[model samples]
Target: GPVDMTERLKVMTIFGTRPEAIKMAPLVLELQKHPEKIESIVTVTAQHRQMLDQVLSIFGITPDFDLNIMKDRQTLIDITTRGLEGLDKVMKEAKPDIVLVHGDTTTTFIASLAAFYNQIPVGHVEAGLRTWDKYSPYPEEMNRQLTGVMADLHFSPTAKSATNLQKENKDESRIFITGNTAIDALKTTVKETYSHPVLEKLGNNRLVLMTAHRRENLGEPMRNMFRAIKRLVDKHEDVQVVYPVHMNPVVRETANDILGDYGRIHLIEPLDVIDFHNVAARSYLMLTDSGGVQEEAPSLGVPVLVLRDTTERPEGIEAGTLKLAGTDEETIFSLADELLSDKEAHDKMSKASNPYGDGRASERIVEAILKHFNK
Candidate 1:
C-alpha cells in the first residue's frame, strides 16, 4: 500500500544556529536537487541571527520563512516560547510533507515538536548522539534526546549513531545511515582561495585556533580553559593562539579579563563560517567545544582538542582524530602540550581516518527520502 509517487514530496528544513545551518545546508541543497519528486521549503528561526546568516549566504540558502526572534543574550524561555509560536504559524501556512531538523539546539527540539503537534512526520538528521548525562552539556544533551523521540525518520551519521537509535527500539525501516551531512557541506563550499584579517594578523606562527562557549562552561570552567591556553602559548616560542570570542557579554568579559593582556593570545571577534573553516584548515591545531568542529576538522586533516568534560561525538574520539581534553587546567595544558611537542602524537591523530562521512551523505539522503515515501 504505497502512496502515489506522482506528486512532489514537500520537505521543509528548519534550523536556527550556525552549526545546525552548516550541517543542514547540504541536506537542504540535496532536497532542492529533486524538485520534480521533492519540493524543498526552507525555514529559519534566526535563533542566533548573525552567525546563521553567514552560513546561509555562503551556502546560497534563502529561507522561505524567517522567524527573526534573535535578541541580545536571549534566554532558554525566550527561545522555546518564541520559536514554538513562530514555527506553529509557519507549519500552518506551508504544511510540509515532513519537517527536517539537525542536531541539538532549542530550534531542533521545538521545530520537531511543532511538526508532531500538527500530525506531521519529522526527520531528524544526526540523530542518536548521546553523552548519557542529562546536564553535562546542559540543554544540548536533552534537546537531542527529545528530538530522537519525535523523529519518524532518523538519519544517523554513522554506524555508532545507527546502533544508538536501534537500542532505543527505533523501527529498522525508519532509520537511515546516511553519514553526517557535515561532510557534504564541506564538499559544496568553494575551496580555499582567500585570506582573512585574523590570519594576516598572526602570520607564520603555529596557529592554535580556539572556541568555547557551552552553557555549562561559563565561569570557572571557561577560566581554567583560558588559563591552560596561556600556559601552552608561554612554553612554545612559535606557538600562538586565536580565540574567536563568543558574542555573549559574560563570555566576552571573562575572556578579556584573563586572555586580554597576552600578546600571543588574541581574543578576536567570532569569524564567519567560511573564514573559520579556512582558518581551521590552515591551523596547526584546533581547540573547540563546538560539536560541529569535531566532525569537520577531522576531514580537513586537522586534529581537534575537544575542551569539555564529556562529548556526545565519540566517533572522532574512537577514530583518534580528536582528544577529549577536559576543562581541568593542568590536564588540558598537559594533553595539548604533548600534541604540540610530539610530532608522532600530532601526526597519529591527523592521519587517522575520519569516521564521520565520505562526502556523499547528501546523495544518500535524497535516495532515503524517496524510498521512505515509496517513490
Candidate 2:
C-alpha cells in the first residue's frame, strides 16, 4: 500500500493542557512539512488555558478550533463534558479522515470518544501507556485505557508501551513504535545561544531545576517535596534551585510557603517551552513529579530525582537516568544530598542513555499516517 498523493487526507490533531501541547507541538510542525500527503488541522480544548497557550506561542502553532473551556475550580466532570461537547462540534465541521489525540488528558479521552461517535478513525499519539492502578495518577490512567479501546492507530512511544497495548489485544498491524514526540521537540527548542536572567543569577553554582504539580501530590505530598528541596538548598552552598511554579493556586501557595524567600531557591512563574528546554540543558540535576520532564531531562544529560512513589515511566528508572525519591521529605532530601555530594553517582546517571527516542519520532508518525491511508 502507498499514499496516492493526488488527494490529501485530513488529519485532525486535538489536544489540551500544557504537557500534551509540549509533546504535540513537534508533531504538528512535522505534519505541516508534508503538505503533499496530509492536510493537518489542529484543535485545542484549552483545558489548561494559559499554560497551553504558552506552548502554542512557542511552537508558533495556531489551533484551527479553540474550545476555550477553562473555568476556575473545574472538576473532571466539567473537563469531560466540555471537551466532548466541543470536539463533537469540531469533528462534525472538519470531518477529518482521522482524529489524533495526545497523551492521557481528559481532552485526549473525550476527543477520542467524540471522533468514535462520529465514525472517524482515531490515531492516538503517545498511546498505550498504563499504570494498571485505577486511581494512582487519577483519571489519566483510566483516560489512556479508554482511548486505547477506541483508537484505530496506536503511536506507542516505546516497546514496553507497545507490549502493554498488545496485552490488551490491540491489533499489531495498527501499532507503531515511533518513540516519543517530546524528544523530537528538543531539536527545535534547545539552543546554544539561549540565555536567561535566571542563568545569569546562577553564576558558578550548579543549577537544580525542579517541577512538582501532579494532582495526586497536591497537598501534603507537595509540601514534603518543597521541604526536601529547601533542605537540599540549605545544605548545598554551590547549588541553586530554579522552580518554575505551576499556575495551580494550591501548588503556588504551598511552594511559596515552604521554599520561598531563600536567596538560592528561586520560585518563579511557569516557563514557556523554549525557556524550560534551554534551562534544562544547563541544569546539573532535575527533580520533578511531572511526566514529560522525566523523558526530556535524560536527553539533556541531566539526572532526575522523581518526586513520586510510583511512575508510569519505568523505562527511565531502568535506564538509570531517573530515581524515584517518592514524596517523603527526609527520603527526598537524603537522595538529593547523596547525588549532590557523590561525584560517581551523579556521573553514572548523567551518562545513562535516554530510552525515550532518537528525535525521529515525528517523521515516523507522519510516514505511518500517510501509509495507513495510502496518501
lDDT, candidate 2, 16-123, per-residue tens: 999999889889999998776788999999999999999999888999999999988788999999989989999999999999999899999999999999999999
Worst 10 residues of 1 by lDDT: 185-194
Q: lDDT of each prediction vs. the true structure?
A: 0.87, 0.90
Across 156-259, the per-residue lDDT of candidate 1 in tens digits comes to 89988889889989898888888899888776552658787777877677889999899899999989999998899889889889888877888898899889
Q: In candidate 1, how many Å is residue 172 off?
A: 1.5
RMSD of 2: 2.4
Residue pairs with backbone overlap in model 2? 3-374, 3-375, 4-374, 4-375, 5-375
Lowest summed-lDDT stretch of 10 residues in model 2? 1-10
C-alpha TM-score for every candidate: 0.95, 0.96
Cα deviation of 69, candidate 2, in Å? 0.3
| Cα RMSD to the true fold for all candidates | 3.0, 2.4
